[PDB]
Design a binder for this molecule. Structure first.
Ligand SMILES: [Zn+2]
Ligand SMILES: [Zn+2]
Length: 112
Protein backbone atom coordinates (compact mmCIF):
# COMPACT_ATOMS: atom_id res chain seq x y z
CA UNK A 1 0.00 0.00 0.00
CA UNK A 2 2.15 2.92 1.37
CA UNK A 3 2.60 6.49 0.13
CA UNK A 4 2.00 6.16 -3.61
CA UNK A 5 -1.53 4.90 -3.96
CA UNK A 6 -1.75 7.52 -6.69
CA UNK A 7 -0.38 4.91 -9.01
CA UNK A 8 -3.87 3.45 -8.54
CA UNK A 9 -6.85 4.90 -10.42
CA UNK A 10 -9.34 4.47 -7.61
CA UNK A 11 -7.19 6.61 -5.36
CA UNK A 12 -6.87 9.35 -7.95
CA UNK A 13 -10.59 9.10 -8.67
CA UNK A 14 -11.20 9.75 -4.98
CA UNK A 15 -9.44 13.13 -5.27
CA UNK A 16 -12.42 14.32 -7.29
CA UNK A 17 -15.15 16.03 -5.32
CA UNK A 18 -17.05 19.06 -6.58
CA UNK A 19 -15.63 18.20 -9.98
CA UNK A 20 -18.19 19.60 -12.39
CA UNK A 21 -19.00 17.48 -15.45
CA UNK A 22 -20.75 14.56 -13.82
CA UNK A 23 -20.94 11.61 -16.20
CA UNK A 24 -21.21 10.84 -19.88
CA UNK A 25 -18.87 13.38 -21.43
CA UNK A 26 -15.24 12.73 -22.26
CA UNK A 27 -14.20 14.51 -19.06
CA UNK A 28 -15.66 12.34 -16.34
CA UNK A 29 -13.63 12.06 -13.15
CA UNK A 30 -12.93 8.50 -14.27
CA UNK A 31 -11.51 9.58 -17.63
CA UNK A 32 -9.51 12.32 -15.98
CA UNK A 33 -7.96 10.11 -13.29
CA UNK A 34 -7.47 7.60 -16.10
CA UNK A 35 -5.22 10.16 -17.79
CA UNK A 36 -3.18 10.54 -14.60
CA UNK A 37 -4.79 13.58 -12.96
CA UNK A 38 -5.85 14.33 -9.39
CA UNK A 39 -8.27 17.09 -8.31
CA UNK A 40 -6.78 19.96 -6.31
CA UNK A 41 -8.99 23.07 -6.60
CA UNK A 42 -8.63 26.49 -4.92
CA UNK A 43 -10.52 29.75 -4.55
CA UNK A 44 -9.32 30.93 -7.94
CA UNK A 45 -8.62 27.47 -9.36
CA UNK A 46 -11.88 25.46 -9.05
CA UNK A 47 -11.09 22.95 -11.80
CA UNK A 48 -7.35 22.65 -11.23
CA UNK A 49 -6.06 19.16 -12.01
CA UNK A 50 -2.50 17.84 -11.80
CA UNK A 51 -0.72 14.73 -13.09
CA UNK A 52 0.33 12.55 -10.13
CA UNK A 53 3.31 11.73 -12.36
CA UNK A 54 4.29 15.00 -14.16
CA UNK A 55 3.09 17.29 -11.46
CA UNK A 56 2.10 19.60 -14.27
CA UNK A 57 -0.99 21.64 -13.51
CA UNK A 58 -3.73 22.37 -16.01
CA UNK A 59 -6.97 24.29 -15.93
CA UNK A 60 -9.90 25.29 -18.09
CA UNK A 61 -11.68 21.99 -18.74
CA UNK A 62 -14.90 21.38 -20.69
CA UNK A 63 -17.35 18.40 -20.66
CA UNK A 64 -16.16 17.35 -24.07
CA UNK A 65 -12.45 17.35 -23.44
CA UNK A 66 -10.36 14.24 -23.76
CA UNK A 67 -8.04 14.50 -20.68
CA UNK A 68 -5.33 12.46 -22.36
CA UNK A 69 -4.87 14.74 -25.34
CA UNK A 70 -4.69 17.87 -23.25
CA UNK A 71 -2.25 15.98 -21.03
CA UNK A 72 -0.37 14.77 -24.07
CA UNK A 73 -0.30 18.30 -25.47
CA UNK A 74 0.79 20.31 -22.45
CA UNK A 75 3.27 17.72 -21.17
CA UNK A 76 4.53 15.64 -24.16
CA UNK A 77 7.33 14.16 -22.10
CA UNK A 78 5.33 12.47 -19.32
CA UNK A 79 6.74 8.95 -18.88
CA UNK A 80 3.37 7.93 -17.47
CA UNK A 81 1.92 8.62 -20.90
CA UNK A 82 4.28 6.32 -22.77
CA UNK A 83 3.13 3.11 -21.07
CA UNK A 84 0.20 2.16 -23.33
CA UNK A 85 -0.75 -0.22 -20.57
CA UNK A 86 -2.50 0.25 -17.22
CA UNK A 87 -0.11 0.27 -14.26
CA UNK A 88 -1.65 -3.02 -13.12
CA UNK A 89 -0.07 -4.61 -16.16
CA UNK A 90 3.42 -3.21 -15.61
CA UNK A 91 6.09 -5.54 -14.30
CA UNK A 92 7.77 -4.62 -11.05
CA UNK A 93 10.70 -4.08 -13.36
CA UNK A 94 8.92 -1.34 -15.33
CA UNK A 95 7.26 0.08 -12.21
CA UNK A 96 10.60 0.61 -10.48
CA UNK A 97 12.03 2.03 -13.68
CA UNK A 98 9.08 4.42 -13.97
CA UNK A 99 9.19 5.42 -10.34
CA UNK A 100 12.78 6.55 -10.62
CA UNK A 101 11.61 9.16 -13.11
CA UNK A 102 8.63 10.24 -11.02
CA UNK A 103 10.82 11.04 -8.00
CA UNK A 104 13.27 12.81 -10.32
CA UNK A 105 10.38 14.89 -11.61
CA UNK A 106 9.22 15.67 -8.08
CA UNK A 107 12.60 17.25 -7.30
CA UNK A 108 12.59 19.13 -10.61
CA UNK A 109 9.29 20.56 -9.37
CA UNK A 110 10.79 22.02 -6.21
CA UNK A 111 13.65 23.12 -8.44
CA UNK A 112 10.63 25.08 -9.64
ZN1 LIG B 1 1.85 13.72 -16.68
ZN1 LIG C 1 -4.54 23.28 -23.74
Amino acid sequence: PQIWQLYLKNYRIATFKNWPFLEDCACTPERMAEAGFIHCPTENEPDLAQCFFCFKELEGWEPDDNPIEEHRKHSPGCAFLTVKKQMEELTVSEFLKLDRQRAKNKIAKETN
